[PDB]
Structure formats: C-alpha cells, structure tokens
C-alpha cells in the first residue's frame, strides 16, 4: 500500500508536469479538458468520443495488460456516475478478469513444473542411455545429444527461475547483479535451445533432400550456429536494456525490446516449418511412386508429421499468438502450456525410448546384465 | 551297361563302408564322458577392442609369439595389431578389396591374404627398406581363395572354390600338389600340428583328410546334412571338428573314421560360422550367425556359456598360440579380445 | 507489449509475481465503484 | 563321364582298407589328453589376474 | 630400453591411425555395386556403353565415384560367395529374358532365391530387362513360343499406364509388361519394406543405363535416410 | 467551499516551505521532492474533506498547476527513467538479429556439405 | 550320406498317366524345400516345380501348369510327381534336388550341373 501510494503520488507529479507542458487542446468544438482522477493522466478528448488508457499496476488487483477506457459526453464533461454525478472512468474492468486469471495461472504453474520435471528427468536418462551405448554412435546421435543437453539446461533453469525467483521478491528488491547475470543466462540458453532446434531441422533437411550421397558433414558450423550465434542476439539485448530500460533485474516483460531475442527464433521455426512442409512433400511423392493405398499414405503422413512436429518445434509457428476471446484464449493458453512444458519429454520418448535400434541395443545388452 | 555297374559297385563300397563304420562303432563318446566333471559357468568378458577397420572382418590369425596377430577386413586393408598395448604396428592395402582369408607365418616374417581374386598374395614384414611390399603372387587357381595357412617361410598350402586344394612354392611361385577329391567348393582348412597333413571341409556336407607328401585322400568323413563352414583341428592332432549351415556342430576323429558327438540344441537354428578349439582341447568355441559364439563342451555335449558382446555377425574367432587370450572378429568391423 | 508462443512462460511468470503476493491467502477486491477515480 | 565313375570306386576301394580301431578306445585317448593339459590352459579353469597380459 | 620402445610404438600407432583417418574419407565417399547378369545375358555391353576372379570397374557420375564389381570365372555355385556383397549398396540384376529357347525361368528362380536370402533382405535389387529389341522381333515371329513356356500369358491384360515406345506394336507391349508383372509379383511377395525392386527397360547399347541406376541409388539413399528417422 | 478555497493557498504555502526547507532552490531530487509531496496530498485532502467534495475540482485542477508553474517548475522533471527506444533507431536494431540469423541458416546450409 | 533315390519312370504313351516317387535320407525330410528338375536329351537342365517345408506352398512353371501335379509326404519322407495327358516333350531325365540350407525359404545352385544334394535320376521316356 505504501509503494502503491508512492508510485501514485510520482504518477501524479509526472502527470502535472506533462500537463504543465501540453496546456493546448489544439482541437476544435466542445471538448473535455484534461484532468487528474486520481489514478491515470487523461488528455483533452472530443465531446462524444470514448477515449483509451493503460491500466494502471498500482495493486495487484489490476492486470496491466489491459486497458482503461473513459467516455466523454457530448456535452464536452466527462462521464458522470449516475449514483453521485461524480466524475468516473471504467477501472471496473481491470478487477473483474483478475481471479479466474489467478486460479488458471497457479494450474498453469504446477503443470509447467510437473513437466519441466518430468522432462528433466527422461532427457537425462535418454542421455545417459546414448552415452552408454557407444555402438549407436553417428553425426546425428552427436546433434541429438546437443539438443538434449540444451533442453535439460533450460528445463533446470526454468526450474530454478519458477521456483526460488518468481516467489521471494526480497531478492529484486536487494537488486544484485548476481539476477541480471541468470536472466542473461536463461534468455543465452533459450535461444542456444530454439538454434538447436533449427539446427536439427536443417541437418534433417540437408540430408533428405539437397545432399543425398555425401554421408561425412563438418559439425563445426552447427556448433557455431547452436551455441556460438546466440550470444550476439543476447549481448545485443543486454546492452540496449543497460542503455535504455534498466529496471531491477530484467523481469519486465512490457518492454518491446524482449522481441530482440524472441525475434529471430520466430524466423528459425519458420525455417523449420518450411523445412518440415518440404520433407511430407518429399515423403508423399516417394510413397505415391510407391503405390500404395490413399488411405495408408494419409495414416503414414500424419504419423510422420506428428513425429517431426515436437523435435522441430512446430507448435509455437501453428499458434503464435493469443486468442482475444476469453474462452477460446483459455483454451489455447492451457494447450500451449501443455505441448510447450513438455516438449522436451515428447522428444526423449520419440527420438529414444520409441526408436526401433535403441530398443534391440537395450534388449541386447539387459541381456549381457 | 559300363556306367550302370560301375554305380552299382560304388554301392557296394558304401554298403561295405557303412558296415565297418557300425562294427567299429563300440561305444560313444557321450555315454564314456556321462562321470565327467562339467566345467561349470564360464564367465568371459572384452578385455581390448580394436576400432581400426572400416568394413566387415572376413578373417583374422594370430601369431606364433601370441601377441602380434593380422586380420582381413573387406574394405582392403590387412592391420597388424599389437594385442597388449592395443596399438596397431602394419597398415597394408590390398589391390583387391574383396578378401576372405589371411595367414600369419610360424616364423613371423611373412603374411598372406586372399579372396575372389583368385590368388594368393606374400607379404614380408622383415623388409630392410621399412616399408612392406608384396613378395609373390601365386596365380594357379581358378576359383575364390577361402583359407590359406604357412607350412613354413617356403612352402603354404591353400583350398579355394574350385573343389581343390592346393600345395605352393613361394619361392618358385608355382604349384607343386593338387588335391581333387571333392565334389564342392571348399571353405576352411587346418593344419595338423605336425604338419604332415590336413583336413577341409566343403559345400559338399563331408571332410577329407589329404597327406601333404603325396597328394593323395586318406579318407572322407560324412555325417553333416548341410555345407561345411569351419573346420580346425584338434590340438592333439587326432581329431577335428566343424560346423554347418544346419546349426549343428561335429567331432570327429581320423583313427575311427567316423562321427563321435554332435552339439545342437532346439534354440539354435543359425548356421556356424567359425570352430576353433581350446588349447586344452576341453573348450570348443564356436561362432553362430545370432550375433553369439558359444563356448562348446568337448567331452560333454551340454553348452557351457556364450559370449554376446558383437553387434553384428561373427565371422572369424581365433584361440592364442599360448591360450592366453581369444580375439574374435564380426562384421561390424570390431575385433574383440577375450579372457 | 509481447503476444509470442516464445514469449510465454515469462508472461505467466510475471503475473505470478505481480499480482500475487507470494502465494497469500487472501486479496482483497480494489473498489472500483464510484468512490474510487 | 566314364571316368568320373572309375575314379569313384578307386577312391572308395583303396578307403575301404584303412585300418580302424573301435570309437571306445579314441573317445578315451580324447579324454586323457584334455585331462593331462587341463591346468596348462587358462581358459578352462579360473586364472589370476595379475599374470595375464589382459588387464 | 623399455622407454625408447614405447616411444616408437606410439609414434607408429599415430602415423597409421593419421593414415587410416584419411583413407576413410575415400572408403565411404564411393559406392559399391554388384553387376549379376545371368549367362549370356549382354552384360558386357552394359559395362562397356559407359584367372581372375573379379573385374571392378571404376566409373564416375555427377562428382559421385561408383564402384562396379563384375564377378567372373567363378562356378556356377553361388550360394557361398553372393554372402560377401551384403554390404553392397544395391546388387544390378540383369536378364536376357527374350533368349528364351527356358533362360526366363531359370532367371525367375534366381532373382527369387536372391530376393529371400537373408543376407540380402536389406539390400535393395534393381532390374535391366535387357534386348528389349530382339524380344520384339522373337515375339513377332509366328507362333512365338511364349504361351508354350507361360501359358499365362494368353489371359494377361495391358494395363493402362503402359506407355509404349514410339514405332512399336501392342503385341511386343505385351510380352514386355507381361515379364515385368511376373518380377514385380515376387518382390512385392515379401518385400515388406526392407528392400525394393526397380524394374527397368534397356537396350544392350544404352548410355542411359548409368543414369538409371545413379537415379535408383538416390533412391536408395534416400529411402534409408527416412528409415532412421521412422518416417518410412 | 470559500474556506476551502482559501486553505487550499495555505496548503500550497506550506508545501513550498516544506520543499525550501529540505532543498534550497532545487526540489527535483527523490526524497526532498517526496517528502513535499507527501505534505502537499497531506493539507489537499484536509481541504477537500473540509469542501465534502471529491478531489480535483477544475478550479483545484488550476491552482494545482499554477502552484506547480510557480515553485516546481525550476527543474526539467520531463525526464523520466524507463523508455522504450523510438521506432526509429528500435526497427534495424530488430531487424539486424533476424536477417543475421536468416541468412545464417542459409550459410549453414551452403558449407556444412563443402 | 545325404542321398535322394528315385524311383518310377518307365514307358507310357502320350496322354496316358505315370507316378513318380523320391525317397529321401539322412537328413530331416520336413526341414528341406524339395524341388524338381529335369535334363531334357541334348539340352541343358531346367525347373519343374517345388513344395514348401510344410506343403502349403506349391509353385508350377508354366509348361507343366495343369498337367502335372505334386506331393510330398513328411510322414514317410518321401516326394511324388503325379502326371497326366503326357506330351512327347516329356521324354527327360527327372532329377529330385533339396534346398541344402533348412530353415530358409530360399536357396541357390538347385538347377546346377555340380550340384551334390541331387539324387540319381530316373529316365522317363514317352512314344507312341
Ligand atoms: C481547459 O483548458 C483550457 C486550456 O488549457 C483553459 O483555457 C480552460 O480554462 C480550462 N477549463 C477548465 C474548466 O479547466
Ligand atoms: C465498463 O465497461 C464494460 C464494457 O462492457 C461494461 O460492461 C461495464 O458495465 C462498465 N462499467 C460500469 C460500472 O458500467
């Protein structure tokens, strides 16, 4: 309440001083002048004409993410509360959205570290599992192996942001250098993971399609490109949040420079949705030169796309953004939720424990114990 | 008229050789052997594993010393491997990559290697100019080589798919004894430890004992109900064993000229594709196309352990002059040494 | 401000720790009536 | 051919007069020769490790 | 000295390892293929149209190195020796099924035992059906003694995707599809995946023949490249 | 409402000593700033409770920002701490990252096979 | 010894009816695919017909297709070719051959001249 106070009083002061320097209305006809209610800074609006704000983050009762909206009566007055003919504007649908909000996002919390969990732990054991087994060794278990080690760096430090950051606010508070330098890390390996991820897309690609004969490739440049070209993407957003948007430790999301790091990986998937769309179509021709039934090729196609769509990342390219609607946002939020939290389990259980080699080498070797 | 008795008294000799083979038949090998102690679990497991060739392992020999030992390999290289540091001291190509057989000689200063080229190439690893190159190449056979092995530095006797066998002068590089008394392609062969004569097995389900001296057939030995893959013979130098495509093995002997005991079981329905035995003779080791080599009983007919640890097909097996170690190579291009 | 598949679980993140005072027990409706601006 | 079959039955004829022994006298020939070897060769029975080259 | 000896061993072992690393790179960036043209089945002039026991020929198309074994003055015995090609990337099959005189069923056997051997299970076989041109003019001829051999052959129909070639008759059309179905029934028979069949025309003097099967090893590639992911 | 009024001038005095007591001609820090603040809202609410109506009336509104004019218009405190960068100079700085890792995955693509 | 004797054959006349009967030893007769084959008078050697391990697949080539049938009897381990409507192109040396390898479906060298897992052979001749 007494940050709450003070962040409205400094919101007063800096709305006076705005207003202090845009004295002119500079319109024309009936108008209603600006005025302080108390809450947000509103400027001269037309006379007849609804006008549009921010909603404040004063209390935790309000979602920022919204927006106020004040109507202007024809008259050239603000709007009037029919109970007291007080000047008022609609704060009232910050508060209404807020507790279902909050009792979807606490389910939301416990199934995003149920299955950060969950993929922790097959990705390790799928790991262990390709280590032991030298016999399975090849360029593409290598790159596997990157991309199981990527996801369980970022699964634990997902973890460890859920569980002793978002909590305790003690430590913002404090504000060390010791959280910016985990946000750098944590946003550093997101993008090394979603590289991965283009990077297995384009060496299935390279050898499907482009490059058939030619069985030794040079590894150095999906090295570079997983774990050395993220780094730019990230020092780059890290400077320019130095410079501009310092806050506490890097946690606000309502700055547009987060699409510094979010950006590119939104073209690596396209890249890889493409890549993906070019590989069906290489696989639909080869079974219709095959002859086979229409009915069996739709089965295969499906069952070949939903085996690729988890490795290549394909979920975040099919639903990008968030719905409007109310119920239909709930839906894809608990839907993407899902697939995103266990994304990482879904590829150890395809690309390892369902793979027809590994299972005879466990076969084999449970034997040999 | 001339044809039809000559067959019928072909006949005659096998009704008559089939009689001496029952009368002589006494007693058998399992029911002598029925007191023996067995010799209970044995547990083997990788010791070394050579990584340095790149296609299948057709073929591998150990050497007189007992740690130096060459293997074949498809892809057209014969490596020399150094069994204790596990460094590898030879690195020869082959103009032909197509190999199936290699030799070690008991001297040490020479190796020989073929396949379906044909011929038999020598190589002396003595060379003063620090580098090996071939010797001489014997070019007498018509067929696919399967097995070569060293008499001495001067002589190698060699057994191909052309139904014989072969006896060479390296130094001449021309043959000097050939045996013609088979009916199939031939696959293996073993020397007796003292050399005065050895055995083959070929596609033709039955073994024949050749005397080196005089290049004439002994004796036949017949029993198998499939083509003969591997023989070897018997450290004692009076009996064999081999294996065939009917995942069943054999021993025999040359003094009673017939079958003694057959090791099978219903499980094992894949053909054998090495026999080597022990240097006690006890232990039969013998490799299977189910990617196993089981350790075969001698005296007892039950098995005693197997050793899984190949990928892929076993292809050659060899036990050390001393007993010390066995090295088997498969067809995932690994050679593995066990003790 | 920031609508990404990408952009999640930092969004849901940031909303727990805004509008919930470290897991409490109760939060009391901020009126909205016509005694509040 | 004709002389396929001559060569058979010469073959079969000079076989036929091998000298043989009964199996019960081999069979145990094969036994004590694996008896009197059986504690030179590591194989059959357990060995120390610390002579053996394969460590 | 011990010492000095472990010296000389190590740097030996590195100079061969170094040398094995570089042959590797030649091993695997060329192909093997085995040629099994049947007894006077025009082989040679598919070699040529660009006491030993074996002749490779070495041949290069689109910057890919090929190798092509010729397997000569062997037996006729090839249960033991067609084991060693297992690791070959596919085995050429070439039939003279126009010298018929019983050449296409003694073909028909072979190529069956070579589709279910196992060893060969996993290699992909493709097929020349070779003098295109003299089966014309054999079937031509009156009362050719097709039916006698396949009486089959008076109740078989043309399907109708069978394209001709330009100047020819639908009699020759026949006979030439009517062996092409008998191979592909016994593929299909038990080819579950693990290995295909690609039936081919060509003439004895055919360039193009290089070109075919540089297109079915892509194929090849291409088909067991998908198998490691399970998409096929 | 006229007493009031005439408080509201008294408030307004009040809250310039107080700033003038804690800063000498510059208000525009943290503390000293808040504190006259704090003061100010303090003798504004005693006035508007005194009037029985809801703060800001215009006439509120006027003396508000003629007092603001008056005393706190010294320093330039249009600055304000967190922005976002203008289009201007934000657009390449987003585009660069993108068209890097684009033409990145197409140089992967062209040398990896080499 | 592996050995497949032969039995049968004889003089018939064209369209009329003859059986022939292949008696196997040695070996296990339900292991092996039996095939047949027969060496025509001044020509090669050529395929008949074979039955599967268990009898439940037969093949035909296409001269004898309808004319002449098959049957194996693991019980007595013995192979019969039962024959009907003889032509005079019939008149061959028939030869009772084994797949030398057991548990597969699959074998080579059948029609081989140096084949040895082939038995003796009958003559069957047929004229007016
Ligand atoms: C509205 O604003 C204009 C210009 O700033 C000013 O002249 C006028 O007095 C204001 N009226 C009220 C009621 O605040
Ligand atoms: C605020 O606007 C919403 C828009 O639908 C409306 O439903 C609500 O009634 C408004 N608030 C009040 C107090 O009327």
């Known amino acids: 309440y007494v940050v709450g106070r003070k962040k409205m009083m400094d919101a007063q002061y800096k709305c006076y001083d705005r207003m202090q320097q845009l004295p002119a209305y500079q319109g024309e006809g009936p108008y209603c002048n600006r005025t302080w209610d108390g809450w947000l800074c509103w400027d001269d609006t037309p006379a007849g004409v609804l006008s549009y704000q921010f909603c404040p983050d004063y209390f935790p009762d309000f979602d920022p993410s919204e927006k106020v909206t004040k109507y202007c009566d024809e008259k050239g007055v603000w709007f009037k509360h029919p109970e007291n003919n007080r000047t008022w504007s609609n704060y009232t649908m910050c508060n209404a959205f807020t507790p279902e909000k909050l009792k979807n996002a606490y389910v939301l919390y416990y ?20 280590v032991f087994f030298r016999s399975l060794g090849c360029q593409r278990v290598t790159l596997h192996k990157n991309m199981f080690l990527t996801y369980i760096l970022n699964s634990m430090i997902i973890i460890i942001h859920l569980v002793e950051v978002v909590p305790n606010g003690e430590l913002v508070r404090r504000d060390p250098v010791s959280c910016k330098i985990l946000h750098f890390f944590h946003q550093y390996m997101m993008a090394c993971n979603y590289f991965w991820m283009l990077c297995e897309g384009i060496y299935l690609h390279t050898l499907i399609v482009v490059a058939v004969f030619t069985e030794k490739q040079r590894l150095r440049w999906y090295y570079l490109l997983g774990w050395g070209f993220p780094l730019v993407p990230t020092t780059i957003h890290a400077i320019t949040r130095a410079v501009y948007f310092n806050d506490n430790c890097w946690l606000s999301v309502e700055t547009h420079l987060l699409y510094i790091i979010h950006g590119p990986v939104m073209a690596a998937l396209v890249v890889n949705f493409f890549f993906l769309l070019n590989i069906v179509r290489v696989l639909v021709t080869k079974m219709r030169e095959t002859h086979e039934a229409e009915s069996h090729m739709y089965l295969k196609a499906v069952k070949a796309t939903m085996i690729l769509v988890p490795l290549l990342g394909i979920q975040f390219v099919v639903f990008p953004w968030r719905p409007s609607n109310k119920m239909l946002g709930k839906i894809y939020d608990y839907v993407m939720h899902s697939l995103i939290h266990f994304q990482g389990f879904f590829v150890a259980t395809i690309y390892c424990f369902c793979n027809n080699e590994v299972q005879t080498t466990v076969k084999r070797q449970w034997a040999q114990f | 008229s001339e044809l039809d008795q000559l067959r019928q008294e072909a006949e005659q000799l096998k009704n008559q050789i089939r009689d001496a083979r029952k009368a002589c038949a006494d007693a058998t090998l399992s029911q002598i052997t029925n007191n023996i102690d067995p010799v209970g679990r044995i547990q083997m497991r990788t010791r070394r594993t050579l990584r340095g060739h790149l296609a299948k392992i057709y073929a591998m020999h150990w050497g007189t010393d007992s740690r130096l030992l060459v293997s074949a390999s498809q892809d057209g290289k014969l490596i020399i491997w150094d069994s204790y540091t596990t ?44 580098n090996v190159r071939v010797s001489r190449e014997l070019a007498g056979h018509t067929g696919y080589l399967s097995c070569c092995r060293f008499l001495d530095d001067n002589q190698i006797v060699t057994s191909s798919g052309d139904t014989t066998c072969a006896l060479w002068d390296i130094e001449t590089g021309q043959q000097t004894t050939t045996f013609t008394g088979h ?76 079958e003694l005991m057959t090791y099978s079981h219903d499980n094992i329905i894949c053909g054998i594709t090495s026999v080597s035995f022990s240097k006690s003779g006890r232990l039969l080791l013998a490799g299977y196309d189910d990617f196993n080599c089981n350790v075969w009983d001698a005296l007892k007919a039950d098995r005693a352990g197997v050793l899984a640890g190949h990928d892929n097909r076993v292809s050659c097996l060899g036990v050390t002059d001393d007993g010390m170690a066995v090295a088997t190579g498969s067809w995932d291009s690994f050679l593995k040494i066990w003790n | 401000k920031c609508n990404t598949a990408t952009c999640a679980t930092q969004r849901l993140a940031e909303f727990l720790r805004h509008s919930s005072n470290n897991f409490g027990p109760i939060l009391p409706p901020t009126n909205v009536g016509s005694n509040t601006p | 051919s004709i002389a396929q079959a001559r060569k058979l039955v010469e073959q079969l004829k000079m076989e036929a007069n091998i000298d043989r022994i009964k199996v019960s006298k081999a069979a145990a020939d094969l036994m004590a020769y694996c008896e009197a070897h059986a504690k030179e060769d590591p194989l059959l029975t357990p060995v120390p490790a610390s002579e053996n080259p394969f460590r | 000295d011990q010492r000095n000896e472990e010296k000389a061993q190590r740097e030996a072992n590195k100079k061969i390892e170094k040398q094995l690393q570089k042959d590797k790179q030649v091993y695997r960036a060329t192909h093997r293929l085995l040629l099994l043209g049947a007894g006077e089945s025009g082989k040679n002039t598919i070699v040529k149209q660009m006491t030993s026991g074996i002749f490779e020929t070495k041949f290069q198309v689109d910057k890919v190195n090929f190798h092509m074994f010729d397997v000569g003055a062997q037996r006729d015995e090839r249960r033991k020796w ?30 069956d035992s070579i589709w279910n051997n196992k060893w060969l299970r996993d290699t992909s076989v493709i097929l020349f059906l070779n003098k295109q041109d003299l089966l014309a003019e054999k079937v031509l001829a009156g009362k050719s003694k097709i039916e006698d051999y396949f009486p089959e052959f008076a109740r078989y129909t043309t399907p109708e995707d069978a394209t001709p070639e330009p100047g020819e008759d639908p009699r020759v059309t026949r006979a030439k599809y009517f062996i092409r179905d008998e191979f592909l029934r016994i593929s299909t028979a038990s080819g579950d995946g693990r290995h295909y069949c690609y039936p081919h025309f060509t003439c004895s003097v055919d360039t193009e023949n290089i070109r075919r099967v540089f297109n079915d090893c892509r194929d090849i590639i291409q088909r067991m490249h998908l198998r490691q992911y399970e998409l096929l | 409402e006229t007493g009031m009024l005439e408080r509201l001038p008294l408030c307004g005095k009040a809250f310039a000593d107080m700033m003038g007591k804690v800063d000498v001609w510059k208000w525009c820090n943290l503390s000293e700033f808040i504190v006259y603040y704090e003061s100010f809202t303090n003798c504004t609410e005693m006035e508007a409770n005194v009037v029985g109506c809801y703060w800001p009336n215009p006439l509120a509104q006027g003396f508000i920002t003629g007092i603001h004019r008056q005393f706190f218009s010294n320093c330039t405190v249009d600055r304000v701490h967190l922005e976002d960068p203008p289009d201007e100079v934000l657009i390449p700085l987003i585009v660069i990252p993108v068209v890097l890792t684009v033409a990145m995955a197409g140089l992967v693509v062209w040398r990896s096979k080499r | 010894q592996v050995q497949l004797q032969e039995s049968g054959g004889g003089l018939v006349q064209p369209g009329g009816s ?16 039996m095939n047949w084959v027969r060496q025509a008078p001044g020509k090669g050697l050529e395929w008949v017909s074979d039955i599967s391990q268990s009898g439940a697949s037969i093949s035909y080539t296409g ?66």
């Open chain 1, 111 to 130: 199934l995003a570290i149920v299955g950060h969990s969950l993929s922790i732990f097959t990705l390790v054991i799928s790991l262990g599992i390709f």
């Open chain 2, 87 to 130: 460094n590898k001291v030879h690195a020869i190509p082959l103009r032909s990559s197509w190999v199936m057989t290699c030799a070690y000689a008991p001297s040490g200063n020479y190796v020989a290697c073929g396949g379906l080229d044909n011929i038999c190439s020598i190589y002396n690893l003595k060379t003063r100019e620090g």
């Open chain 7, 18 to 33: 003859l059986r022939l009967s292949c008696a196997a030893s040695g070996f296990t007769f339900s292991n092996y695919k």
């Open chain 5, 82 to 111: 067609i084991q060693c090609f297992n690791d070959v990337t596919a085995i050429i099959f070439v039939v003279a099924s126009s010298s018929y005189n019983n050449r296409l069923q003694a073909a028909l056997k072979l190529f």
């Open chain 7, 63 to 128: 001269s004898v297709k309808g004319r002449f049938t098959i049957s194996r009897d693991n019980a007595k381990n013995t192979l019969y070719l039962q024959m009907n409507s003889l032509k005079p192109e019939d008149t061959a040396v028939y030869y009772c051959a084994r797949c030398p390898a057991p548990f597969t479906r699959d074998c080579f060298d059948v029609t081989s001249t140096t084949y040895a897992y082939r038995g003796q052979g009958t003559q069957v001749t047929v004229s007016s």
């Open chain 2, 183 to 258: 009916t199939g392609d031939v696959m293996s062969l073993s020397l007796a430890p003292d050399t005065r004569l050895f055995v083959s097995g070929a596609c033709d389900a039955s073994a024949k004992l050749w005397d080196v001296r005089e290049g004439m057939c002994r004796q036949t030995f017949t029993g198998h109900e499939s083509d003969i893959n591997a023989i070897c013979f018997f450290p004692n130098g009076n009996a064999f064993a081999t294996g065939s495509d009917d995942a069943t093995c054999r021993l025999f002997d040359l003094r009673a000229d017939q």
